[PDB]
């Protein structure tokens, strides 16, 4: 979202966090900034 995927191996970052979980395929489109849904608002929501 904030970075181009190709220009990732040439930047220096301050705080890098990784979040791992397992969801279903209809909810893959849910994980995005500014989204709703029971896995977004009640489980895990990305800020906009």
């Amino acid at each position: 979202y904030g970075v181009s995927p190709t220009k990732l191996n040439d930047l220096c970052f301050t705080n890098v966090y990784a979040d791992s979980f397992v969801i279903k395929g209809n909810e893959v489109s849910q994980i995005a900034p500014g989204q709703t849904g029971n896995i977004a608002d009640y489980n895990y929501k990305l800020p906009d």
Binding site: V3, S4, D10, L11
Partner: protein, 49 residues
Amino acid sequence: LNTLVKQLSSKFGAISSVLNDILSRLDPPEAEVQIDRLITGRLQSLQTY
């Protein structure tokens, strides 16, 4: 002169006020979109000065 120099460090609705950071993070089709806001803001500040 201090207002003109200090106005250079604002974003004008872009991701950052530093131009080299914009060029070193994004692909050119989105980079030009990010640059144009800075260009309009700095032209406006120069014309008011």
